[PDB]
Amino acid sequence: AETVSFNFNSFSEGNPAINFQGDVTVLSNGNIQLTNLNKVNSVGRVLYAMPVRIWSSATGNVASFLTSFSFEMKDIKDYDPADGIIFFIAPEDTQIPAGSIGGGTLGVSDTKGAGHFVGVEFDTYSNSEYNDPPTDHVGIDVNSVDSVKTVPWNSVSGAVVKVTVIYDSSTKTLSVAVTNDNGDITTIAQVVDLKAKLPERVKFGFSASGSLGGRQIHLIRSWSFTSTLITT
Amino acid sequence: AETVSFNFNSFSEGNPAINFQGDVTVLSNGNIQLTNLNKVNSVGRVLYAMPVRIWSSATGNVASFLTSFSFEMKDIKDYDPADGIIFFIAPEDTQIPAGSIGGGTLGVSDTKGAGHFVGVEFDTYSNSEYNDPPTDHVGIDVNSVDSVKTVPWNSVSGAVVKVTVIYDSSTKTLSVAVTNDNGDITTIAQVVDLKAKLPERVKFGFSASGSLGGRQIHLIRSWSFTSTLITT
Amino acid sequence: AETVSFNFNSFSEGNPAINFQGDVTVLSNGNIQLTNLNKVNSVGRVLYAMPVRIWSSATGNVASFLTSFSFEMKDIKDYDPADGIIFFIAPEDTQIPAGSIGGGTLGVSDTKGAGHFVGVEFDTYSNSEYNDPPTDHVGIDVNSVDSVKTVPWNSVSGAVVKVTVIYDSSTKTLSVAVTNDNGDITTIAQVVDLKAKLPERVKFGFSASGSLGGRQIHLIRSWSFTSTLITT
Amino acid sequence: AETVSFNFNSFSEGNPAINFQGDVTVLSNGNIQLTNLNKVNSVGRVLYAMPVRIWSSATGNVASFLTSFSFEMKDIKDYDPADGIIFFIAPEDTQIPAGSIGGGTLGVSDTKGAGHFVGVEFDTYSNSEYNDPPTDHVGIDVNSVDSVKTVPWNSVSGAVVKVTVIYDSSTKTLSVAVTNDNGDITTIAQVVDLKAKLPERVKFGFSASGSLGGRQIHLIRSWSFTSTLITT
Ligand SMILES: OC[C@H]1O[C@H](O[C@@H]2[C@@H](O)[C@@H](O)O[C@H](CO)[C@@H]2O)[C@H](O)[C@@H](O)[C@H]1O
Ligand SMILES: OC[C@H]1O[C@H](O[C@@H]2[C@@H](O)[C@H](O)O[C@H](CO)[C@@H]2O)[C@H](O)[C@@H](O)[C@H]1O
Numbered sequence: 001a002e003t004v005s006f007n008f009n010s011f012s013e014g015n016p017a018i019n020f021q022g023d024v025t026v027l028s029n030g031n032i033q034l035t036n037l038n039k040v041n042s043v044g045r046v047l048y049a050m051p052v053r054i055w056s057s058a059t060g061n062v063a064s065f066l067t068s069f070s071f072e073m074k075d076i077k078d079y080d081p082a083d084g085i086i087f088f089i090a091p092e093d094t095q096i097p098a099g100s101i102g103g104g105t106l107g108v109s110d111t112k113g114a115g116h117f118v119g120v121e122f123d124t125y126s127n128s129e130y131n132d133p134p135t136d137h138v139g140i141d142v143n144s145v146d147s148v149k150t151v152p153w154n155s156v157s158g159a160v161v162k163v164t165v166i167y168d169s170s171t172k173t174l175s176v177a178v179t180n181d182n183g184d185i186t187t188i189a190q191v192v193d194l195k196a197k198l199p200e201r202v203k204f205g206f207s208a209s210g211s212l213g214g215r216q217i218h219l220i221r222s223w224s225f226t227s228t229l230i231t232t
Numbered sequence: 233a234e235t236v237s238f239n240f241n242s243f244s245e246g247n248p249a250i251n252f253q254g255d256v257t258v259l260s261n262g263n264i265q266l267t268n269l270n271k272v273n274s275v276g277r278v279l280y281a282m283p284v285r286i287w288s289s290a291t292g293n294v295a296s297f298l299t300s301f302s303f304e305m306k307d308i309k310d311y312d313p314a315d316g317i318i319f320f321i322a323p324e325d326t327q328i329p330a331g332s333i334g335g336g337t338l339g340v341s342d343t344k345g346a347g348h349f350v351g352v353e354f355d356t357y358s359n360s361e362y363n364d365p366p367t368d369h370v371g372i373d374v375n376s377v378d379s380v381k382t383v384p385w386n387s388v389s390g391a392v393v394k395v396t397v398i399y400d401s402s403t404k405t406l407s408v409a410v411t412n413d414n415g416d417i418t419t420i421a422q423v424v425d426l427k428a429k430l431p432e433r434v435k436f437g438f439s440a441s442g443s444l445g446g447r448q449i450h451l452i453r454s455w456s457f458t459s460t461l462i463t464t
Numbered sequence: 465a466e467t468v469s470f471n472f473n474s475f476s477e478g479n480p481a482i483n484f485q486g487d488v489t490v491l492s493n494g495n496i497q498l499t500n501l502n503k504v505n506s507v508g509r510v511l512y513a514m515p516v517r518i519w520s521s522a523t524g525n526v527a528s529f530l531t532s533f534s535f536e537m538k539d540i541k542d543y544d545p546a547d548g549i550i551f552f553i554a555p556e557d558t559q560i561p562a563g564s565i566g567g568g569t570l571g572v573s574d575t576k577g578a579g580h581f582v583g584v585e586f587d588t589y590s591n592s593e594y595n596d597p598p599t600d601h602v603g604i605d606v607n608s609v610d611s612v613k614t615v616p617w618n619s620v621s622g623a624v625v626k627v628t629v630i631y632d633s634s635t636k637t638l639s640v641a642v643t644n645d646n647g648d649i650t651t652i653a654q655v656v657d658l659k660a661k662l663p664e665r666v667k668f669g670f671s672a673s674g675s676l677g678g679r680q681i682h683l684i685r686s687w688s689f690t691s692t693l694i695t696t
Numbered sequence: 697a698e699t700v701s702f703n704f705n706s707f708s709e710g711n712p713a714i715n716f717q718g719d720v721t722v723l724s725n726g727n728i729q730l731t732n733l734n735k736v737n738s739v740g741r742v743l744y745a746m747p748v749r750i751w752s753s754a755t756g757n758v759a760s761f762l763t764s765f766s767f768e769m770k771d772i773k774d775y776d777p778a779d780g781i782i783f784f785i786a787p788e789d790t791q792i793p794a795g796s797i798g799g800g801t802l803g804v805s806d807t808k809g810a811g812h813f814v815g816v817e818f819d820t821y822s823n824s825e826y827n828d829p830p831t832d833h834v835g836i837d838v839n840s841v842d843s844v845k846t847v848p849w850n851s852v853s854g855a856v857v858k859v860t861v862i863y864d865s866s867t868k869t870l871s872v873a874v875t876n877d878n879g880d881i882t883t884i885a886q887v888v889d890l891k892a893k894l895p896e897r898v899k900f901g902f903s904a905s906g907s908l909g910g911r912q913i914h915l916i917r918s919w920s921f922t923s924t925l926i927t928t
């Protein structure tokens with residue numbers, strides 16, 4: 001079978017295994033900081049440089065994958081803790097939307113909240129224009145930040161969060177399990193047909209954004225990934 | 233929220249947090265060995281001693297959980313490498329079925345393969361009496377070892393296998409990610425209504441079995457777990 | 465290593481991880497209330513349901529533990545604010561003393577003040593029959609409410625109190641740090657050989673009590689714990 | 697009672713409340729990075745700017761204190777993960793030793809390993825010249841990096857570590873509890889007469905160092921502190 005597998009205990013710019021877009025930067029501690037605290041409508045995204053083949057036009061087979069990552073969001077004076085981080089999957093040529101306003105678009109959608117991507121968002125601000133729930137939340141997005149589904153969550157400033165994601169191609173189910181500083185686990189799952197929503201080859205990554213008054217530290221600390229596609 | 237969480241990097245015979253049943257034994261290296269290589273129809277099970285409320289009768293709420301564990305199965309002469317291991321959930325009064333014939337029952341069912349439990353099996357022998365697929369496989373079991381669903385897999389003697397399981401209460405989806413020796417991942421997911429199949433309080437654990445001619449080393453090396461039930 | 469770690473941010477009566485004894489009750493806010501304000505000689509205790517092995521007869525090793533908890537004691541008309549709360553450790557079979565008179569016994573000892581337990585008391589009433597110092601105090605008890613050692617302290621009605629306790633097995637030192645509302649910390653430490661005073665298997669918990677004329681609200685708000693026993 | 701209390705959830709290169717010495721820097725994420733990964737024999741230290749009065753020349757009384765802090769150490773290509781971090785107490789005029797060679801001195805002592813300070817070290821390299829134990833370890837130091845006492849420990853690269861320290865003045869005992877990545881807690885306690893070893897007013901802080909071939913990321917993420925001196 002065809003398998004893609006990698007693991008980042010730390011990140012470093014100048015490492016070809018990753019694409020850097022927007023205001024992203026890598027701190028001396030190896031952490032990826034997606035947004036620039038000193039910019040309006042800041043937007044930063046990171047992508048595994050190598051495109052991953054998630055499905056086949058020859059066989060119709062779709063890959064299954066298991067990926068885990070840890071991130072950290074932390075408040076700062078004197079802006080609102082916004083806007084959040086989104087782990088996403090998109091066409092290999094994906095780029096930050098032209099004239100991106102950042103903010104609630106999480107750096108992957110247009111002003112209306114649309115784009116070509118599937119992702120899991122960790123939202124820390126309620127944008128009514130995208131029908132966000134009243135509190136912080138984890139959401140499953142399919143070509144829109146107006147989540148197909150969300151679950152109440154709480155972004156704890158300064159806390160390291162661990163996420164586990166399983167995509168079962170057979171049932172087309174994307175399951176997500178997220179850590180919480182208080183010890184609880186939060187989960188959300190959703191049937192998502194990657195073959196119908198995304199091209200055969202895609203890029204996986206992370207994006208985060210802020211606005212004029214909405215800014216916070218967005219860090220990606222580690223990331224492991226393994227996908228397997230049955231070939232014939 | 234009511235949460236039960238723990239993390240076992242190794243095991244010990246004296247830990248009251250673990251219920252030992254049957255032929256289970258603890259090796260000097262901290263590994264748990266489930267079956268006795270010298271006994272016929274051997275059955276050994278290990279359960280977390282703390283009952284877990286997977287659902288509430290008062291609120292109707294159902295918990296979600298994340299758990300990971302690693303195990304190892306190793307051949308031995310001159311017996312057939314059987315029968316396998318099963319990660320299961322059962323009522324808190326659960327015990328090895330009286331008069332258990334072990335073998336293909338995996339220590340959780342009767343001769344007919346029926347029982348009161350939900351589990352994920354790592355089956356290394358094809359029992360036609362339970363409609364097993366022809367090769368080694370991972371299966372989702374609901375009150376029977378005649379799996380509700382299975383996926384082809386391969387048990388490599390002496391290999392360490394990493395497993396990640398996510399149960400999303402909202403969708404009632406049980407997702408399993410199995411990371412093989414060769415690096416490939418294998419997944420299987422199934423909608424299982426724990427609230428409809430099990431009581432409010434249950435126990436989680438592992439069971440393994442053998443027959444007269446089928447015997448192998450069944451080891452549980454580690455186990456982390458977190459389940460959360462929304463209360464109040 | 466053998467480790468036991470849990471973290472209660474709040475409580476619930478149906479949570480199997482907690483043994484309730486006596487007049488204990490759970491408030492809608494998740495707080496545990498140990499005594500019954502309307503009962504003479506009230507006694508209420510709460511225990512972590514699972515036995516904790518604090519030392520091994522096979523290795524002679526004793527565990528170290530770090531535990532933090534917050535409680536609150538508030539006066540009421542027209543009773544004297546008594547008698548206090550005690551964080552204790554005792555045999556796994558520990559029950560409220562038969563015919564307990566509550567009051568100065570704190571629900572862990574008999575009339576003479578003797579019992580089988582080790583604990584840190586937050587005493588708010590001076591019982592001369594137990595040689596209490598003249599004012600409120602924190603004390604280290606070993607099989608008796610006639611403290612092996614005490615330190616002047618002040619129980620502020622309605623004040624939330626935080627406590628951190630460290631037990632270093634190697635030095636057998638039980639160190640306590642109490643953070644009052646006014647910000648000051650109060651500490652007391654005492655060498656206590658848990659191995660010599662307690663059985664290998666014990667249970668940790670809290671107890672509070674009152675008399676006919678001595679009653680007050682005793683609340684346990686949170687409790688985190690981690691013990692580690694070196695296994696060799 | 698004279699109480700000194702503070703809390704840092706993040707730091708900033710501009711808050712005078714902290715003295716920055718040597719190569720220390722403050723990252724955009726609010727973390728303090730003690731050493732410069734690009735410098736030979738790098739040394740960085742941070743001190744709470746306000747001197748703390750730990751004892752009275754009038755009463756002879758000594759203060760008790762409770763402090764908690766979190767840190768992180770991560771490896772880097774292609775140097776040995778060294779040398780570690782030390783939480784220390786020293787005269788208010790304390791400065792990095794003249795002509796410091798960094799390395800095993802941890803930035804608080806001369807070449808022989810001598811200095812004027814009391815501290816808890818999180819050592820990640822075995823210096824025979826200072827009688828270090830063979831593995832990583834937590835040590836209690838008194839005017840020397842040739843620890844008065846040590847306990848085996850393990851520094852996990854990329855892991856956030858929480859530490860809690862209690863100093864009980866009456867028993868002159870310094871107790872430490874370290875919360876590791878795998879869940880276990882590591883403790884060490886030692887009687888240290890602060891009044892006999894340190895001046896009336898001191899500064900508390902953190903220090904880390906590296907050498908030519910020994911370098912790693914030394915981060916301080918947070919730090920809470922409370923000390924109380926009884927005045928009669
Ligand atoms: O506060 C941060 C947020 O900023 C923007 O949201 C609104 C803004 O449109 C306007 O309504 O004013 C309020 C309060 O001043 C908010 O700032 C972004 O649209 C959000 O994404 C978020 O960053
Ligand atoms: O061979 C291991 C195997 O033993 C038992 O079943 C087999 C059966 O499938 C085969 O047809 O015949 C042999 C010899 O009579 C055994 O009966 C167990 O039931 C099975 O689980 C496995 O352990």
Ligand SMILES: OC[C@H]1O[C@H](O[C@@H]2[C@@H](O)[C@H](O)O[C@H](CO)[C@@H]2O)[C@H](O)[C@@H](O)[C@H]1O
Pocket residue numbers: 544546547566567568569589590591674675676677678679
């Ligand atoms: O007042 C509350 C107090 O009641 C009981 O003791 C007192 C005793 O200290 C006092 O001297 O006399 C009264 C009247 O007889 C009570 O005996 C409890 O023993 C004590 O713990 C406290 O609850």
Ligand SMILES: OC[C@H]1O[C@H](O[C@@H]2[C@@H](O)[C@H](O)O[C@H](CO)[C@@H]2O)[C@H](O)[C@@H](O)[C@H]1O
Pocket residue numbers: 776778779798799800801821823906907908909910911
């Ligand atoms: O390798 C990091 C390590 O360097 C130094 O330790 C010894 C050094 O004293 C000795 O002379 O040579 C060996 C190998 O070249 C090591 O470098 C530092 O003293 C030590 O603190 C640590 O930083």
Ligand SMILES: [Ca+2]
Pocket residue numbers: 083104123124125126127132
């Ligand atoms: Ca939003």
Ligand SMILES: [Ca+2]
Pocket residue numbers: 315336355356357358359364
């Ligand atoms: Ca079978």
Ligand SMILES: [Ca+2]
Pocket residue numbers: 547568587588589590591596
């Ligand atoms: Ca008393």
Ligand SMILES: [Ca+2]
Pocket residue numbers: 779800819820821822823828
């Ligand atoms: Ca050293």
Ligand SMILES: [Mn+2]
Pocket residue numbers: 121123132133137139145147
């Ligand atoms: Mn959203």
Ligand SMILES: [Mn+2]
Pocket residue numbers: 353355364365371377379
């Ligand atoms: Mn089967």
Ligand SMILES: [Mn+2]
Pocket residue numbers: 585587596597603609611
């Ligand atoms: Mn007392």
Ligand SMILES: [Mn+2]
Pocket residue numbers: 817819828829835841843
């Ligand atoms: Mn050392």
